[PDB]
mmCIF file of C-alpha atoms in Angstrom:
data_model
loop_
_atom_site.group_PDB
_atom_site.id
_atom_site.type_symbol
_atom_site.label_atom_id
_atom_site.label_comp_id
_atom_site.label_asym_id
_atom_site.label_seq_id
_atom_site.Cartn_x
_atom_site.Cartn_y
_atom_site.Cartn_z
ATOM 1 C CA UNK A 1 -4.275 -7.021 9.750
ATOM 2 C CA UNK A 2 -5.634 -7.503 6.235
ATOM 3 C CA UNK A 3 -3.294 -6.003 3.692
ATOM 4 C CA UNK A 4 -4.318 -5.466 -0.287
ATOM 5 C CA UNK A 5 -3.124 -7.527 -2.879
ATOM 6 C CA UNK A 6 -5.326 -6.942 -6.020
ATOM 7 C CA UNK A 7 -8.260 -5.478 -7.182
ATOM 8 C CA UNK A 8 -11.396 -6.706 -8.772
ATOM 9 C CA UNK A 9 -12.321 -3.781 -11.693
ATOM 10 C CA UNK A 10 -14.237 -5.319 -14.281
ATOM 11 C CA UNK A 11 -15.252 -8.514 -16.103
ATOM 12 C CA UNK A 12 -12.903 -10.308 -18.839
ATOM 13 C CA UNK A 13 -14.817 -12.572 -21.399
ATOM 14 C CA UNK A 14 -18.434 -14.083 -21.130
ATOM 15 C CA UNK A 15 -17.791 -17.492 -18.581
ATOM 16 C CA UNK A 16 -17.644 -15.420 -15.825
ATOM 17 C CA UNK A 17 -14.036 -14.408 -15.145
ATOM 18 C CA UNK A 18 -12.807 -11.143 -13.824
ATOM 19 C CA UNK A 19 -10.541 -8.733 -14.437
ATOM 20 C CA UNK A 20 -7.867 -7.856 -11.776
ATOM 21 C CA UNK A 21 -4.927 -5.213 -10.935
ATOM 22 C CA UNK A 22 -2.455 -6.723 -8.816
ATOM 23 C CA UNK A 23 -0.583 -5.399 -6.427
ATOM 24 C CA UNK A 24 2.067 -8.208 -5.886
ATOM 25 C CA UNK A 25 6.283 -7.953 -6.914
ATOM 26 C CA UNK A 26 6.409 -10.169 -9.275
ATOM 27 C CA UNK A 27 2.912 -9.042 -10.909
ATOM 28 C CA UNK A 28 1.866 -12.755 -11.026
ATOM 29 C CA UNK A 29 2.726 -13.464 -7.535
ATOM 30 C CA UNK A 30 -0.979 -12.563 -6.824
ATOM 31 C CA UNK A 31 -2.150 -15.939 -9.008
ATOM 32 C CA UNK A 32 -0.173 -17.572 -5.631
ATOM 33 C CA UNK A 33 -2.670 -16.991 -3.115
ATOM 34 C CA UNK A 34 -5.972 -19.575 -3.514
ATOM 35 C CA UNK A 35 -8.135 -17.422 -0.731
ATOM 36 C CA UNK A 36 -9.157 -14.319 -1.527
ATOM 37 C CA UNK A 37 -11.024 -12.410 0.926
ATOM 38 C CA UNK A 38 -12.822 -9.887 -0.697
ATOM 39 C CA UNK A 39 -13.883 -6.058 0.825
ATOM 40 C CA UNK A 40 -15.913 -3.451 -0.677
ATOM 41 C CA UNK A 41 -17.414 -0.654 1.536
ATOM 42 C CA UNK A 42 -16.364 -2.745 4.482
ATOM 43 C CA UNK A 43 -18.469 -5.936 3.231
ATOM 44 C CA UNK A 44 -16.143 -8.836 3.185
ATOM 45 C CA UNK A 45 -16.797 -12.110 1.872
ATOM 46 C CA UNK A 46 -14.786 -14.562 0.769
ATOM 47 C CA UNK A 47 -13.060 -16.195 -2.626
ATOM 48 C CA UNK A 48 -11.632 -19.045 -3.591
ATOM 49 C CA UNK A 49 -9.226 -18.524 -7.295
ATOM 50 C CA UNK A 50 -9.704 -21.142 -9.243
ATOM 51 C CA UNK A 51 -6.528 -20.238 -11.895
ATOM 52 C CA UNK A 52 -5.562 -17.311 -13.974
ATOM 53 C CA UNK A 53 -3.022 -15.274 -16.200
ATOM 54 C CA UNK A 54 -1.799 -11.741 -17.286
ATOM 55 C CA UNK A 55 -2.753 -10.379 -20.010
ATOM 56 C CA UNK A 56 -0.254 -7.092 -20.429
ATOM 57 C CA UNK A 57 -0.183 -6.221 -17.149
ATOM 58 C CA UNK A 58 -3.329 -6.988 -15.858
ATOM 59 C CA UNK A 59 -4.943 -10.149 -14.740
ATOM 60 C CA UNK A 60 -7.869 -12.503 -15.617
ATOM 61 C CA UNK A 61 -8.915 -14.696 -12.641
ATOM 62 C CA UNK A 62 -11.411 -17.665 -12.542
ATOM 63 C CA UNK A 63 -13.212 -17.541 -9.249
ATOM 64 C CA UNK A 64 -14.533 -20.881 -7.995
ATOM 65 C CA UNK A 65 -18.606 -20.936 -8.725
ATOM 66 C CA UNK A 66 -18.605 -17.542 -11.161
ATOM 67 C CA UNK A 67 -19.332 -19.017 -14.084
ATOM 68 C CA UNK A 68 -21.258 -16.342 -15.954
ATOM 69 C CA UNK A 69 -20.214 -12.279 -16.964
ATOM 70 C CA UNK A 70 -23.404 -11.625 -15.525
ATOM 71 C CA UNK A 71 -22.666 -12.439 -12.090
ATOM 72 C CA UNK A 72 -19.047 -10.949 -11.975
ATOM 73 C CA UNK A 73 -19.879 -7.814 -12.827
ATOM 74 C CA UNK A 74 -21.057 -7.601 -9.504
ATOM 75 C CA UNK A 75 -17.602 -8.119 -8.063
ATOM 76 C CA UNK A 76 -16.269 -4.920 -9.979
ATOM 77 C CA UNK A 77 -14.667 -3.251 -6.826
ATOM 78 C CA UNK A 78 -13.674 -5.717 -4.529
ATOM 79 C CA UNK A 79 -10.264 -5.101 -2.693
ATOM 80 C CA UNK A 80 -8.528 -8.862 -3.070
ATOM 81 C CA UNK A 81 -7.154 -8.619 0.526
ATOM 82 C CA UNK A 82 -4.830 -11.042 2.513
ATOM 83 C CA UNK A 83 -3.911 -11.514 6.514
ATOM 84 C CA UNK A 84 -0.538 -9.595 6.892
ATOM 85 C CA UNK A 85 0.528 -13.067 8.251
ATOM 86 C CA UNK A 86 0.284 -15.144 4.962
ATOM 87 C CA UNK A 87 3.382 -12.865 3.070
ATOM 88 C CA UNK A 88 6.597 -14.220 3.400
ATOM 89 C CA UNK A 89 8.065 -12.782 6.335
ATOM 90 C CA UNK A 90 13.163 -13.676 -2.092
ATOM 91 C CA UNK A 91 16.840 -13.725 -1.489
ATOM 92 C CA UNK A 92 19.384 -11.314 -3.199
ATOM 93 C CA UNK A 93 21.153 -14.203 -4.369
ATOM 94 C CA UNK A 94 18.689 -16.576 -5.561
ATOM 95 C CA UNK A 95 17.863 -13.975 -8.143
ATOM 96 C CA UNK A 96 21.498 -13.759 -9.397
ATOM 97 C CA UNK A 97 22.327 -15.512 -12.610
ATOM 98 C CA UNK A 98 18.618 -14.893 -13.684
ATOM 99 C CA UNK A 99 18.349 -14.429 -17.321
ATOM 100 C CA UNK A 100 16.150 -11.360 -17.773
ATOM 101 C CA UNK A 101 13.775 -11.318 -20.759
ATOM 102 C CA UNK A 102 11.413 -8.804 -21.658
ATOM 103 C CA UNK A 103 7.784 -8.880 -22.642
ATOM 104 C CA UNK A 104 9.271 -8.900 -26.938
ATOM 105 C CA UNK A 105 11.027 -11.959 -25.409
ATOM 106 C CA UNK A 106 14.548 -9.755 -25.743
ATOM 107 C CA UNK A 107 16.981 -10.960 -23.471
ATOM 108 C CA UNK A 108 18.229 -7.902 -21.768
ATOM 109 C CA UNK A 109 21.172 -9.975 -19.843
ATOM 110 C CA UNK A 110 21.709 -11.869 -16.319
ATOM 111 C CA UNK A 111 21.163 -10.088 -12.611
ATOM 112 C CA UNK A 112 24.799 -9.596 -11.891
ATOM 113 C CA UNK A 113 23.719 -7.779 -8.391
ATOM 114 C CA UNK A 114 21.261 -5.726 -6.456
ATOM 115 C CA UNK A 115 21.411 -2.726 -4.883
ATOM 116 C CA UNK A 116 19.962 -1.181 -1.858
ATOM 117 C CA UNK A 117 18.388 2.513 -2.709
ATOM 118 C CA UNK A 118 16.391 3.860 0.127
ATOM 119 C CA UNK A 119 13.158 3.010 -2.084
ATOM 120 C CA UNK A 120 13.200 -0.188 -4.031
ATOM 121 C CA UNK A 121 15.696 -2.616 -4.799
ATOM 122 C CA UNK A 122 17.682 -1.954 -7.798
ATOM 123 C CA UNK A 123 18.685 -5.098 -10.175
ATOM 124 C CA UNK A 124 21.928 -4.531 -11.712
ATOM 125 C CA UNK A 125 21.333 -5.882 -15.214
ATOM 126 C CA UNK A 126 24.896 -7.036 -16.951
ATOM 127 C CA UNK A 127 24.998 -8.210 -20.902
ATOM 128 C CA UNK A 128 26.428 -11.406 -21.676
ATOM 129 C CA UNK A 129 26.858 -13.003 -25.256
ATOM 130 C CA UNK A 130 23.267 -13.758 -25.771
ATOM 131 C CA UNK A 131 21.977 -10.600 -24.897
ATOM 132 C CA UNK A 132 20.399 -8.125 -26.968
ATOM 133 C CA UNK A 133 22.952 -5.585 -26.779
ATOM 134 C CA UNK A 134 26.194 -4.326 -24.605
ATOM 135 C CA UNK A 135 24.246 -2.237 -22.444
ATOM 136 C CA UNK A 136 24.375 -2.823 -18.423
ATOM 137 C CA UNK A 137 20.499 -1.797 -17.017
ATOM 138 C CA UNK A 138 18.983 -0.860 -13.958
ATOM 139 C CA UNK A 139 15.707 -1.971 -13.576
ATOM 140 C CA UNK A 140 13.802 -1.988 -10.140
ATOM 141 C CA UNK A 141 12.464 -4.643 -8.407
ATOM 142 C CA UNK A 142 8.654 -4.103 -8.444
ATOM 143 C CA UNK A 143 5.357 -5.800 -10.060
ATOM 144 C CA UNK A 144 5.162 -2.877 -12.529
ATOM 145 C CA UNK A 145 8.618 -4.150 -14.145
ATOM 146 C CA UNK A 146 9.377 -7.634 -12.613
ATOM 147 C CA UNK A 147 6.054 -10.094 -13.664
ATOM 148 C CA UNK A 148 7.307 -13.702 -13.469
ATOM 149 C CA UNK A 149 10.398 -15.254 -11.904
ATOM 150 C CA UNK A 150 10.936 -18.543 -12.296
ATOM 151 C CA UNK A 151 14.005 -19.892 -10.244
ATOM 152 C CA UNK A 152 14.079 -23.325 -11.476
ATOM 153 C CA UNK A 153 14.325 -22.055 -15.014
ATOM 154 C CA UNK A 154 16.420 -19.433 -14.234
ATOM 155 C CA UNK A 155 14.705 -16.807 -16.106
ATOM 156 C CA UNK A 156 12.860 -13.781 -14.995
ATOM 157 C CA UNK A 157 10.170 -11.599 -16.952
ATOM 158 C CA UNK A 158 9.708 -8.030 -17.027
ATOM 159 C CA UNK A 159 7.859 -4.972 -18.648
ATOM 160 C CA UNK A 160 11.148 -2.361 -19.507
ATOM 161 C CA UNK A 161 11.699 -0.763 -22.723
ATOM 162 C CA UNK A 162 15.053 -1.644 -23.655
ATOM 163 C CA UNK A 163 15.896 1.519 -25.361
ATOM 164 C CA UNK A 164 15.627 3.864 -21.828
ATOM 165 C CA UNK B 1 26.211 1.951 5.748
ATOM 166 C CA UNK B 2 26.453 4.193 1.630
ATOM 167 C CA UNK B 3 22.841 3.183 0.101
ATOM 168 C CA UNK B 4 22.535 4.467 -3.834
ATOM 169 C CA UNK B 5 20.046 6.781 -5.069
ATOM 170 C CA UNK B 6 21.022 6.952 -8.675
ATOM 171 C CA UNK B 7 24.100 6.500 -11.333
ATOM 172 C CA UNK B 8 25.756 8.042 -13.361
ATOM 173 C CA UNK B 9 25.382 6.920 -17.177
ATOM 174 C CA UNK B 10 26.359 8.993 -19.691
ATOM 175 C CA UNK B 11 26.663 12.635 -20.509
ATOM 176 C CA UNK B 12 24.031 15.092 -21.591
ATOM 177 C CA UNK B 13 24.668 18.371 -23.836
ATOM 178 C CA UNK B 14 28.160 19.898 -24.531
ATOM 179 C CA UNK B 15 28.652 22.576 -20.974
ATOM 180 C CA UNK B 16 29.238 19.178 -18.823
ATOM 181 C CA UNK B 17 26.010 18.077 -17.477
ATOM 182 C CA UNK B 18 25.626 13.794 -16.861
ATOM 183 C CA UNK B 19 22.679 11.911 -17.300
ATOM 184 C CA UNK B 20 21.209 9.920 -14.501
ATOM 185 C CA UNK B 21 19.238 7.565 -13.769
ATOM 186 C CA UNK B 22 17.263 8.511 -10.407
ATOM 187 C CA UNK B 23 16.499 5.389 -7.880
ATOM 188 C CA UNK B 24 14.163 7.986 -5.527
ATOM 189 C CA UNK B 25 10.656 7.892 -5.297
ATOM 190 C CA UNK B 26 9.530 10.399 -6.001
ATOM 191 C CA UNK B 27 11.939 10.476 -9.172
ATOM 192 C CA UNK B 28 12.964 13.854 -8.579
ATOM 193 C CA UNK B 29 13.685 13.376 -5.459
ATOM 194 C CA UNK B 30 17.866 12.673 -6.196
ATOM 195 C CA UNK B 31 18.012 16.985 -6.860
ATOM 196 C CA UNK B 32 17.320 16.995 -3.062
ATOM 197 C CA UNK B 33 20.656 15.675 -1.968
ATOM 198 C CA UNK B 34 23.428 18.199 -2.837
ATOM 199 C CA UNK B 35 26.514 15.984 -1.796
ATOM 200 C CA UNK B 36 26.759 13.013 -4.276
ATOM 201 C CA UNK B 37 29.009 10.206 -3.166
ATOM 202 C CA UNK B 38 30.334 8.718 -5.930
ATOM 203 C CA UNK B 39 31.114 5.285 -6.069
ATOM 204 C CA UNK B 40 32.818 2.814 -8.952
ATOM 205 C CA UNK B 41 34.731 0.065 -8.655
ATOM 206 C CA UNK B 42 34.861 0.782 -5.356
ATOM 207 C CA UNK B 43 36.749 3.886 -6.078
ATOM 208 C CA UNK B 44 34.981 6.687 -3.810
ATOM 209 C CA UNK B 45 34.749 10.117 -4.841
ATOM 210 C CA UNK B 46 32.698 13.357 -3.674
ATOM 211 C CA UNK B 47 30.931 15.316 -6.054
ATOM 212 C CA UNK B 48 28.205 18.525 -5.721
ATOM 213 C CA UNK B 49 24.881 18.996 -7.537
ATOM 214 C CA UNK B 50 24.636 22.403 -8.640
ATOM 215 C CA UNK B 51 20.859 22.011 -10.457
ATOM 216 C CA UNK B 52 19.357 19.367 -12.497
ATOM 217 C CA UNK B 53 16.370 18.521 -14.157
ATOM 218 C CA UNK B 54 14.461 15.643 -15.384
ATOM 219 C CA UNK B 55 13.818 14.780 -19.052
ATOM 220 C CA UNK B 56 11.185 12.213 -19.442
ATOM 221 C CA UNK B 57 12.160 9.492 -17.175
ATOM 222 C CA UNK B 58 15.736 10.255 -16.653
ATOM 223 C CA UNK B 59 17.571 13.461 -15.389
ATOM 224 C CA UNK B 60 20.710 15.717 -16.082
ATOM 225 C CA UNK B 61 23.002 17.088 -13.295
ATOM 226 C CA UNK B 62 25.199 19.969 -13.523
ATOM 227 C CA UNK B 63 28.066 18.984 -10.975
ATOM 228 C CA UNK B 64 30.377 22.148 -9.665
ATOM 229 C CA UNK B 65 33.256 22.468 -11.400
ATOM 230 C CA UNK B 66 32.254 20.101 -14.387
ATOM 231 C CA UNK B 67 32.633 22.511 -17.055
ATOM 232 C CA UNK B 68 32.196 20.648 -20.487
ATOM 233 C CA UNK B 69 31.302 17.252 -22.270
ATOM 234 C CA UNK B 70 34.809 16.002 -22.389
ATOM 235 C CA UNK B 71 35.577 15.708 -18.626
ATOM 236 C CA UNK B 72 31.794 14.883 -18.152
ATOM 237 C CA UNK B 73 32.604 11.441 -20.047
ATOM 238 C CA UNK B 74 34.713 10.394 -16.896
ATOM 239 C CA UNK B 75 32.101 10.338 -15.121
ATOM 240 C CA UNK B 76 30.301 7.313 -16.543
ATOM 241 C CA UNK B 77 29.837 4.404 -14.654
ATOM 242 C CA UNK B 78 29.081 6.585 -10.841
ATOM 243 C CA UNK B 79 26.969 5.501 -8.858
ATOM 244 C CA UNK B 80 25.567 8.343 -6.729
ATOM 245 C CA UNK B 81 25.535 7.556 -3.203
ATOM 246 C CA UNK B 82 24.782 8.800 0.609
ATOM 247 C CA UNK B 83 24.544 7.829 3.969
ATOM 248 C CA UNK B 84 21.982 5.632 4.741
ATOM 249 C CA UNK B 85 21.306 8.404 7.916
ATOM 250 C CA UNK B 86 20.878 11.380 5.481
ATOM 251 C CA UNK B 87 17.132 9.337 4.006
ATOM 252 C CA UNK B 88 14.063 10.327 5.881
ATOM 253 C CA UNK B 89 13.730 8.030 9.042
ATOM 254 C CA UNK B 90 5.778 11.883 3.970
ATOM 255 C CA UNK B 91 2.833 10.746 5.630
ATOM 256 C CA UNK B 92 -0.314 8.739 4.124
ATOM 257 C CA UNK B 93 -2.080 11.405 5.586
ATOM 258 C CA UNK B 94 0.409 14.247 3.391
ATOM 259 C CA UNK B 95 -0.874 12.710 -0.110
ATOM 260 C CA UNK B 96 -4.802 12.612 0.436
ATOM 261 C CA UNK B 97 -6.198 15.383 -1.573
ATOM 262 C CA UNK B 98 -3.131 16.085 -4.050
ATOM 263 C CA UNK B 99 -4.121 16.322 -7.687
ATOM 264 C CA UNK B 100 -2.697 13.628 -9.766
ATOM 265 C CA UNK B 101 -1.486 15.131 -13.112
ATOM 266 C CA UNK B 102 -0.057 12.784 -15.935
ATOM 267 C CA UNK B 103 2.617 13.539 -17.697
ATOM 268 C CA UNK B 104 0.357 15.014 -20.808
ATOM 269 C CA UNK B 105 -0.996 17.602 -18.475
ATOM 270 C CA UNK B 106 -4.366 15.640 -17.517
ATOM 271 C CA UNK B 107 -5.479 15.420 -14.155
ATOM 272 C CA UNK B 108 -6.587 12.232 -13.035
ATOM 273 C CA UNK B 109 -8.027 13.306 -10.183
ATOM 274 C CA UNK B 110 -7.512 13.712 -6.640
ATOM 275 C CA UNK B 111 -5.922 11.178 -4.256
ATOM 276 C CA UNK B 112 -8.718 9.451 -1.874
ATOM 277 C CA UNK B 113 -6.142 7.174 0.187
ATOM 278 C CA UNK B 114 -3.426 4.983 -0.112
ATOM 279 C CA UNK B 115 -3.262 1.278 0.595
ATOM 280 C CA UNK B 116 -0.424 -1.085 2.620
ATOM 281 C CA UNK B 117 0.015 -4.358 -0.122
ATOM 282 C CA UNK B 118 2.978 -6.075 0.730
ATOM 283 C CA UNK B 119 4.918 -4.452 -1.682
ATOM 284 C CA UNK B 120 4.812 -0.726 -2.710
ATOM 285 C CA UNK B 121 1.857 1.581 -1.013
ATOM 286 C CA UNK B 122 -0.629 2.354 -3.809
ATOM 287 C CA UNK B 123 -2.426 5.469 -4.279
ATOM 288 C CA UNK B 124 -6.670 5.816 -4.808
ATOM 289 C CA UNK B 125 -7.415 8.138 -7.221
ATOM 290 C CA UNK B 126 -10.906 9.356 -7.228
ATOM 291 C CA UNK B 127 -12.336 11.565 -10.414
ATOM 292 C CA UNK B 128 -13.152 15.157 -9.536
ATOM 293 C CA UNK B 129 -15.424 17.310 -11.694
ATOM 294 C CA UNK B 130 -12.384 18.864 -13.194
ATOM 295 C CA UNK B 131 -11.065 14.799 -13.539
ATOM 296 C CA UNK B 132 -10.090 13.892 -16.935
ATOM 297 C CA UNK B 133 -13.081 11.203 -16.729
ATOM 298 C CA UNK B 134 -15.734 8.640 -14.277
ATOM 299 C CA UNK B 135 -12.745 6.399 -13.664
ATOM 300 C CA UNK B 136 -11.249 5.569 -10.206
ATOM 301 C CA UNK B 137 -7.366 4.337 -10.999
ATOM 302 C CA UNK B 138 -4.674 2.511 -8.573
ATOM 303 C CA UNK B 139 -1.077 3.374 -9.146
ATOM 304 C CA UNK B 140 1.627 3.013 -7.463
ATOM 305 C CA UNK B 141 3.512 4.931 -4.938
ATOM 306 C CA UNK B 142 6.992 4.258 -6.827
ATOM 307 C CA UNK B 143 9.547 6.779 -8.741
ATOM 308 C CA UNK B 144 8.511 5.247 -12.192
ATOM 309 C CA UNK B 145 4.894 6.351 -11.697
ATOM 310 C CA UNK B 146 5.375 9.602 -8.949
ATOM 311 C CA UNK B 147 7.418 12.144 -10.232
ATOM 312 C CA UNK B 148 7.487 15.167 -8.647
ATOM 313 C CA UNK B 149 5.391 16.057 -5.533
ATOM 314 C CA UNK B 150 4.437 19.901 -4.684
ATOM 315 C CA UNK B 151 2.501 19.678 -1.188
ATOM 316 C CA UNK B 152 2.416 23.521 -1.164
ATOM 317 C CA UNK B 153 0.749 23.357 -4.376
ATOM 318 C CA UNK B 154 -1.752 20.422 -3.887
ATOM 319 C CA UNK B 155 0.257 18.605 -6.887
ATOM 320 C CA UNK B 156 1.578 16.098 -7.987
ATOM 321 C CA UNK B 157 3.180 14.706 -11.559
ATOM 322 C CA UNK B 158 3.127 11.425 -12.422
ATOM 323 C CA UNK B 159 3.322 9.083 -15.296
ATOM 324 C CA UNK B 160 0.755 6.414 -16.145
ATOM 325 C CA UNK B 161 -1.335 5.740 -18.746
ATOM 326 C CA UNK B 162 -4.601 6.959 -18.565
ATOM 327 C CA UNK B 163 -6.270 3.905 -20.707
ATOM 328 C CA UNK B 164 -4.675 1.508 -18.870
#
């Protein structure tokens, strides 16, 4: 019952940091989980993340210990994985009234509402007198758009291009 | 028990066509459902898809008996519904071996397996000898990255960028 959250793929910088896909709605919902247990070619072996941050859309993750580019290149490949039990198992409303902002820093409008599609969740995406334009968007709920939502600030970050 | 696969947005040429944005995974996937129920301001409505097409990232619909650009205007603002009993209720299995084809024509390679995150399932691509390059890529199995699937034709069309 281990499930995949991330992926380590290469090295970022020289003090022994790696570089990381994540697999996580929001995108930096990964940076949540201190205990990574790491699998490649059924090897596990365990992680502990020390801190970390995007960069575009991928990740660089300190790794408790790993403090040279020498040593993490050899943990180029390793599945991040997680026990199915340690996901939540968000609510619609708590992301209403989010101001949603995009990686230019454009504010695209509030969540007015989301809809239910069959695949992901839809977030209906209304202007208001700060935003960038008129224009009502539909943007859906997954780590490749949404990469940050912070409900105490009530804003939300995400990777759309504002012209589609 | 209506979920939404799509909306209506605007209108595309001058014979009445609409363009839509698609909420299926795979995108193209909306062109499979014939019987559109239309839905705004909770004002229902029934509607028939003749043919469509995607352009880039969203599609255009010819609807019967929408006949030119004027009347197509009305349209704005849809949202293209169904039954929540008329979605599927593929396989893992299905995918493995499809060749993953960008939307410049390169093939990526050839799906290995797919992997259960917590969110969205994503896909392993391994490089073939035919493979654009050496590089094993993770995308996900979402309507903004899988386009179009052919089964028959051991295909599939996606878009994702091939540095990234």
């Amino acid at each position: 019952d281990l499930v995949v959250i991330g992926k380590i793929v290469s090295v970022y910088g020289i003090r022994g940091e790696v570089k990381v896909y994540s697999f996580t709605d929001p995108l930096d919902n990964l940076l949540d989980y201190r205990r990574w247990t790491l699998r490649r070619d059924g090897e596990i072996r365990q992680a502990e993340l020390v801190r970390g941050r995007l960069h575009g859309k991928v990740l660089a993750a300190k790794l408790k210990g790993l403090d040279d580019r020498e040593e993490a290149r050899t943990f180029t490949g390793y599945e991040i994985c997680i026990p199915r039990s340690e996901l939540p198992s968000y609510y619609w409303h708590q992301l209403e009234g989010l101001k949603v902002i995009d990686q230019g820093r454009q504010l695209l409008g509030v969540i007015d509402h989301l809809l239910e599609t069959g695949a992901n969740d839809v977030m209906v995406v209304k202007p208001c007198a700060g935003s960038l334009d008129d224009r009502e968007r539909l943007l859906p709920y997954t780590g490749q758009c949404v990469l940050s939502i912070d409900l105490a600030a009530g804003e939300m970050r995400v990777d759309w291009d504002a012209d589609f």
